[PDB]
Nucleic acid binder design. Structure first.
Lengths: 206, 47
RNA sequence: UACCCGCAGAAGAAGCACCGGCUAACUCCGUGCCAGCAGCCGCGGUAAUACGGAGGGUGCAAGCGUUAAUCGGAAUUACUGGGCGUAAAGCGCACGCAGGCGGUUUGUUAAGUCAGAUGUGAAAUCCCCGGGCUCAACCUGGGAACUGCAUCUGAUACUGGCAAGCUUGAGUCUCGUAGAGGGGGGUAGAAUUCCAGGUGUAGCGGUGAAAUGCGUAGAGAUCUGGAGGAAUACCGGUGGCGAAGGCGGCCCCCUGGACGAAGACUGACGCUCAGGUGCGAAAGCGUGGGGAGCAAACAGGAUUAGAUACCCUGGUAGUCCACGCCGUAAACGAUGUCGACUUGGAGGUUGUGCCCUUGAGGCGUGGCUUCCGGAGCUAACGCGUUAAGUCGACCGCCUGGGGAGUACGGCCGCAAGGUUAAAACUCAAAUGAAUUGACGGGGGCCCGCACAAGCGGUGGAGCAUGUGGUUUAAUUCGAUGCAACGCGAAGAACCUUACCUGGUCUUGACAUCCACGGAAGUUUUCAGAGAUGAGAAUGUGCCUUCGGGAACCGUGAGACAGGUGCUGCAUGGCUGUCGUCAGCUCGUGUUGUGAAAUGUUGGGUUAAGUCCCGCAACGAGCGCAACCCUUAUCCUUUGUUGCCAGCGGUCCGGCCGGGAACUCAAAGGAGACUGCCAGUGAUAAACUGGAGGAAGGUGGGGAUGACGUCAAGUCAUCAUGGCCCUUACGACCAGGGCUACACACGUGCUACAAUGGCGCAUACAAAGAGAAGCGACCUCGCGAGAGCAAGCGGACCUCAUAAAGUGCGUCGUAGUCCGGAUUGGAGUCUGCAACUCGACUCCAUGAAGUCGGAAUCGCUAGUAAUCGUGGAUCAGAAUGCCACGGUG
RNA sequence: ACUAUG
RNA sequence: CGCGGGGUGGAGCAGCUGGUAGCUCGUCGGGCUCAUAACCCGAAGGUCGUCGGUUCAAAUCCGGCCCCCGCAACCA
């Protein structure tokens, strides 16, 4: 069977939204198309910087991007230098005057997006896929993830037929709404087409 | 299943299209063998 | 000549097989189940480590490979060293001659056996220690070996011989007991059939249901008497006897074996058995009898697509007796005979000896037999003192599957045929036990609008819409049992658009990079269907260590762009499906040679692998459940744009003072948990009922879709590996097409009418939407609409009068005052444009259709049925889709 | 009263 | 040749006494099935060999022509 998206069923229960601005119907489609391009930019720039999550709010006129990332140093560059040359190409893309922030991520082993990006990276430099999965599971479980499954898919070690090996460890309860199930996803672009990588990460409940 | 098969079939195309002389025949005539008195013995029925 | 010395210069001298596994050695390009490879498995159908070539590597190396041949591996002919219950394999059972084997004791002999000695066992070869060719092969000295045969001399445990014994193996006698053991002769009763009568009247018989059949010429039913043949109810029993085949009423005559008790007797007289002889179910054959019932063949009737069958009605050989043959069976315990040893329990049958027989009993001892099960054995299943355990003696038999127990020959037979018993050729398997599944016209328990009980439809008619086909220049592409067909498409006039026709462009409609020129923009111009091609004007945003750079446009050549092109069978992502079904697994332990099993099953119970109790399992995870949204009661807060109970006033309007009660609004809380009572139940889980409660046992509805299944769907949303096109398969335009129509199917809508149609009045909703928007009031128009114009980013204004309903009138069972298809005329609106091809209005026209063959769908309650309302998509275009309330 | 095949 | 019989939907048959074309199978369309066969429902189709006469009217009565069968073709 097909599963509901575990982020999406849990919005306004235990997960919060990422675009958190109000509009009326004139300017709604435009805000969406701005917020798309401000994310489609900041993903392409900060690929090395290890970015979990780009929140956007819109107070007043102005746009306010928070970034969450494993590596604050490489975004802030030196004296900002890089923060401040992000702002003035963001503030074109919005139209309004901008404001970038940063947060850490303390445990990059427990973010779904970063675990997936990680695994997806290793698969493009031709690492054996069972090692790449199984490192990632161990790493989360020694830093106290209550559980974690990962699930790669489709031409693994350059086979001619697609398969999906997956590998749980601990508890991962996806029909429990109360459960914080950090989830995310990534495509590895290899010489054998794409390989897709899901990652769930239970962290406990309420 | 749903397997690759590899059948054959002909076609074949063909178009359409749409008495023996007395000189060419010799005709021996002679007597018969068998049953029936003076008439069988004499006359030459047989061809 | 060997052998030795001198000269010149790395000079004159490396290939063959292999690289998928077995087996040491891997990657590209070509090829596309073709060509080919191959010892065996197999490789090759567009990413080939298996073909062919290349590069590299492995192995041998003056050789390397292929073929043939022998042994090996092969314990696969097994002496060393195999088997035979089910894999191939125990003669159908006995008797028994040659043959093999033989209890115990003393003597003797010295054949086997053992020890020693002599003779011989040609030399070479082989093996050991040496020697000689530069080494090695090659040559050679000495030895060992030649496992053998003979002769002689000893040994005498074992085997054998000869002699003499013994009593335990084997037999004979005495006395009893049980027995469907065999052969011959009588006889009893029950039943079927027929025959002859009496009573009697319309059916009988048969089957799933029938018919053929018998019957008014008196059947079937019933009673009396008679004939004849065959078999022996009850007893009757995993009871008994027999070598096996087999043996079943009672009585007599002839007769075989077994077993038991105590004693006496012979003294190894024994065990096994190729060839040989006998016995040997049923069918079948011969000669002669018999013939009730049954019943191959055969006949008719059914059933069936057919029915040469199963079922029915008949029925001949045969079945029965006598005397001959035949010699076979899943003749089976699928287990040759004889003997010895090796833990137990429960029975049955038949003897026998001891015991207040004191009881149908207590204590022993033989024989045969049934079921459990231990050690051990076995591939496992199982066998298990009656072995398939531990041994010994003799016999029979097996050596891949088919061909084939067949052909030929021999022997036997009256015949049918039996017995003995091949090979060519062909395949790489065939086979046994056990394991997980799936399946069963196997069984058990349980569920579900699955059936049943009901209500309403589809299938027929006309329309709408999708699909197939056909047509076409094109009818763009996709979706195809359930799980495609009002599906992608939440809306094809142009656009959309992917298709066709014709007209155009070639670094391009789209993006980046460099070069050079111009601020961007504005404004009319004549051709042309349009794309497109030929003309007037205009600033200069901006900083300038002043070059121009940046905003933006055209021109220029190449890196490139572009592709709704192919592959969903190379992919990601997303989705359908079994199925909201209760399942799916793991770890550690344990059982098993192992696949696997257990847990997860069993006893209860639940919607539920839900919960309890058990149990070599103990635990864990994904699922179930809960946590979320909505609805059903109440409380708290908060009252405008919502509300109006109690107050005053009124244009009778919550409209205006005011009110904060009530409805309602949307935040926060309470409430339902088997919590309480009774009974049922293994004191358990739970169940049945009751109370209070707005709600009661998951209160109703949604969201939530385990591991996986179908190479399911989608490269045409997007992404993407590979292949492909690059003056075209890319790009621009106008017109056409996706709307075609002999047909077939799907899903809908409207009907066929009085529970109704038309006319006039009149009541009660909910939920939505709205600024290039919703659009009131008033005015014009029969109407669709038009003109003017407040309000409203909206609990305020607008869309917007809900309709079924109700009351009053009217129609009278008619293709109608039912039905509205179709066509003509005239309009309205959106839109550059309604010809192809929009919707709506008015006047006229008034098809089919009178409740739909076989078949088939939905639904368990605010449900079905029926009635309207709104929304997304959208300029316009809803009978579809998503949502809302009414009645019910 | 049912039935065959892939 | 002499005598007699027969040509009927695609197949085998009935109708031949002038005014009326049936039966079983096959074909076509719909169902059932995962699909096919069986089974269930619905619909079509015949110049009556051929030519000519007779009649108001011919599958039918009558003649010629063509094909197809059967019987006869003997006594010397």
């Amino acid at each position: 069977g097909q599963k509901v998206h575990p982020n999406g069923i849990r919005l306004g229960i235990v997960k919060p939204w990422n675009s958190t601005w109000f509009a009326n119907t004139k300017e709604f489609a435009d805000n969406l198309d701005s917020d798309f391009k401000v994310r489609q930019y900041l993903t392409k720039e900060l690929a090395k910087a290890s970015v979990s999550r780009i929140v956007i709010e819109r107070p007043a006129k102005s746009i306010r991007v928070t970034i969450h990332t494993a590596r604050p140093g490489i975004v802030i560059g030196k004296k900002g230098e890089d923060v401040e040359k992000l702002r003035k190409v963001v503030a074109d893309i919005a139209g309004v005057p901008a404001q970038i922030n940063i947060a850490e991520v303390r445990k990059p082993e427990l973010d779904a997006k970063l675990v997936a990006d990680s695994i997806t990276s290793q698969l493009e430099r031709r690492v054996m896929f069972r090692r790449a999965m199984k490192r990632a599971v161990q790493n989360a479980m020694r830093l106290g993830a209550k559980g974690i499954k990962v699930e790669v898919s489709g031409r693994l070690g350059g086979a001619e037929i697609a398969r999906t090996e997956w590998y749980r460890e601990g508890r991962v309860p996806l029909h429990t709404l109360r459960a914080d199930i950090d989830y995310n996803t990534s495509e590895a672009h290899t010489t054998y087409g794409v390989i897709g990588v899901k990652v769930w990460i239970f962290k406990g409940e309420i | 299943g749903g397997r690759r098969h590899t059948s054959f079939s002909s076609a074949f195309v063909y178009p359409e299209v749409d008495e023996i002389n007395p000189a060419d025949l010799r005709i021996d005539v002679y007597r018969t063998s068998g049953a029936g008195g003076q008439h069988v013995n004499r006359t030459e029925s047989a061809v």
